[PDB]
Design an enzyme around this catalytic site. Structure first.
Site, mmCIF file in Angstrom:
data_model
loop_
_atom_site.group_PDB
_atom_site.id
_atom_site.type_symbol
_atom_site.label_atom_id
_atom_site.label_comp_id
_atom_site.label_asym_id
_atom_site.label_seq_id
_atom_site.Cartn_x
_atom_site.Cartn_y
_atom_site.Cartn_z
ATOM 1 N N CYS A 14 0.873 -1.163 0.000
ATOM 2 C CA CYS A 14 0.000 0.000 0.000
ATOM 3 C C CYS A 14 0.916 1.221 0.000
ATOM 4 C CB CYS A 14 -0.874 -0.013 1.263
ATOM 5 S SG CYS A 14 0.141 0.121 2.756
ATOM 6 N N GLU A 128 -0.546 -0.528 16.592
ATOM 7 C CA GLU A 128 -1.435 0.512 16.092
ATOM 8 C C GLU A 128 -2.537 0.880 17.071
ATOM 9 O OE1 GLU A 128 -3.410 0.046 12.216
ATOM 10 O OE2 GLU A 128 -5.091 1.131 13.193
ATOM 11 N N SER A 224 1.737 -9.716 10.440
ATOM 12 C CA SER A 224 0.854 -8.724 9.826
ATOM 13 C C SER A 224 -0.636 -9.034 9.968
ATOM 14 C CB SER A 224 1.157 -8.567 8.337
ATOM 15 O OG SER A 224 0.054 -7.932 7.711
HETATM 16 S S1 F3S Z 1 -0.122 1.566 6.180
HETATM 17 FE FE1 F3S Z 1 -1.236 0.658 4.526
HETATM 18 S S2 F3S Z 1 -2.591 -0.926 5.308
HETATM 19 FE FE2 F3S Z 1 -3.688 1.009 5.384
HETATM 20 S S3 F3S Z 1 -3.470 2.195 7.222
HETATM 21 FE FE3 F3S Z 1 -1.847 2.902 5.885
HETATM 22 S S4 F3S Z 1 -2.625 2.294 3.932
#
Ligand code: F3S
Ligand code: NA
Ligand code: NA
EC number: 1.17.7.4
Length: 318
Positions: A14, A128, A224
Site C-alpha cells: 500500500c 497501532e 501482519s
Molecule cells: S499503512 Fe497501509 S494498510 Fe492502510 S493504514 Fe496505511 S494504507
C-alpha cells in the site's frame, strides 16, 4: 482438469508501507548509519531484514537511542508519550506514521476534546491500537470482541464515538459495529470509516474471486494483521487458505488435487516474494495457467514523505 492461477490485483504494497520504507531508505542515504526506528517499520520480516543490512535498527527502548540522533516512527503510529520522551533526548523525530492511521489518532483527540467517550474496535496488543488508544487513554475503551461490548456501560446522555483499527476484517468489524449500534443507537463515527482503502480493496478483490477456487494463498508475514485477515476472509467464505512468507515455506503437497488457486498478498509484502509463487506455480511440474483477476482499480494516494524530512533533503542538495 483445468488448472488456473488467479493472480489478484490489487495486492501487495500500500502507499503507507511504500512511504514508510522510502522514509527509512532516504534517511540512510543522508545520515550515517545506524538509523533508529521505533518498532518494526512495517510488519514484514523480509523488508525489515533488508533495512537492517542497510544500517537501520529497530528498537522498542528509546534509551537504545543516542540523544540528538534520528528516530523514525513506524507506519503503525506511536503513543504521544513516546514523543515527549523523544524531545527530552532532543531526537530528530521523523514520523512515518501512515496518514490513515494518523487520521484515526486525530479523530480520537478531536472527539475527546468534545467530551465524547471513545470506543476503539481493534486488538488490544497490536501496536497501532495501543498508539491510538494513548491519544485519549482515560476516555477510550477498547473492544476486541462482542463480549467487550456487553460489558460497556455509560450514562444515557453520554456522547459516544467509535473508531477502528485500520486493518480489520470487514466482516468481523461489521459484526461488532452492528452490536455496538444495537446497544448505543446514537453512537457516531468517522463518515469515511477507519478501515483503510488498502485493506478494503485487498479483501474485496480476494472475496470476489476466492469462491471459484480450491485454495487461497496469501503471501505475507504472520506478524501482519491485514495478511491474517485476508486468509480469514477466504476461510469464512469456505475456501481453505494459507499465509506464507515465502515460496520456501510452501508445503507443495497441499497442491495435490487443487486445480484453481487464488493468489494475493498483504499490504506489507514485497512484490518479488509474490512473483516467486507465480514462477513456481505456472511452470513445470505444476503448470497452473496464469490469469489476472482485477478488483476495482485502486487509486494510489499521492502522499509525499514527511515534510520535515523533505526539508532536510532540500538543504543537503545545496
Ligand atoms: S499503512 Fe497501509 S494498510 Fe492502510 S493504514 Fe496505511 S494504507
Ligand atoms: Na484522556
Ligand atoms: Na476524514
Amino acid at each position: 482438469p483445468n488448472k488456473i492461477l488467479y493472480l489478484i490485483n490489487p495486492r501487495g504494497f500500500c502507499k503507507g508501507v511504500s512511504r514508510a520504507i522510502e522514509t527509512v531508505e532516504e534517511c540512510l542515504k543522508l545520515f550515517k548509519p545506524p538509523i533508529y526506528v521505533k518498532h518494526k517499520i512495517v510488519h514484514n520480516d523480509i523488508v525489515c531484514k533488508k533495512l537492517e543490512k542497510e544500517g537501520a535498527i529497530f528498537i522498542e527502548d528509546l534509551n537504545d537511542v543516542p540523544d540528538g540522533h534520528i528516530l523514525i516512527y513506524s507506519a503503525h503510529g506511536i503513543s504521544p508519550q513516546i514523543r515527549e520522551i523523544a524531545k527530552k533526548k532532543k531526537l530528530i523525530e521523523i514520523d512515518a506514521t501512515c496518514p490513515l492511521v494518523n487520521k484515526v489518532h486525530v479523530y480520537v483527540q478531536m472527539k475527546a476534546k468534545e467530551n465524547y467517550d471513545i470506543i476503539l474496535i481493534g486488538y488490544k496488543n497490536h501496536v497501532e491500537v495501543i498508539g491510538t488508544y494513548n491519544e485519549a487513554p482515560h476516555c477510550t475503551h477498547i473492544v476486541e470482541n462482542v463480549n467487550d461490548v456487553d460489558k460497556l456501560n455509560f450514562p444515557l446522555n453520554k456522547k459516544l464515538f467509535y473508531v477502528t483499527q485500520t486493518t480489520l476484517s470487514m466482516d468481523d468489524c461489521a459484526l461488532i459495529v452492528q452490536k455496538l449500534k444495537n446497544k448505543f443507537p446514537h453512537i457516531e463515527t468517522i463518515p469515511s470509516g477507519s478501515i483503510c482503502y488498502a485493506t478494503t480493496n485487498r479483501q474485496t478483490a480476494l472475496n470476489k474471486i476466492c469462491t471459484k477456487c480450491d485454495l487461497t494463498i496469501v503471501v505475507g508475514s504472520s506478524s501482519s494483521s491485514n495478511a491474517k485477515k485476508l486468509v480469514y476472509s477466504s476461510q469464512i467464505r469456505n475456501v481453505p487458505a494459507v499465509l506464507l512468507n515465502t515460496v520456501h515455506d510452501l508445503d507443495q503437497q497441499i497442491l495435490k488435487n487443487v486445480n484453481k488457486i487464488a493468489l494475493t498478498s498483504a499490504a506489507s509484502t514485497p512484490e518479488q516474494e509474490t512473483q516467486k509463487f507465480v514462477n513456481l506455480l505456472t511452470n513445470p511440474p505444476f503448470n497452473y495457467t496464469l490469469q489476472n483477476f482485477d478488483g476495482a482499480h485502486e487509486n494510489v494516494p499521492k502522499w509525499k514523505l514527511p515534510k520535515n524530512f523533505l526539508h532536510m533533503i532540500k538543504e543537503r542538495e545545496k
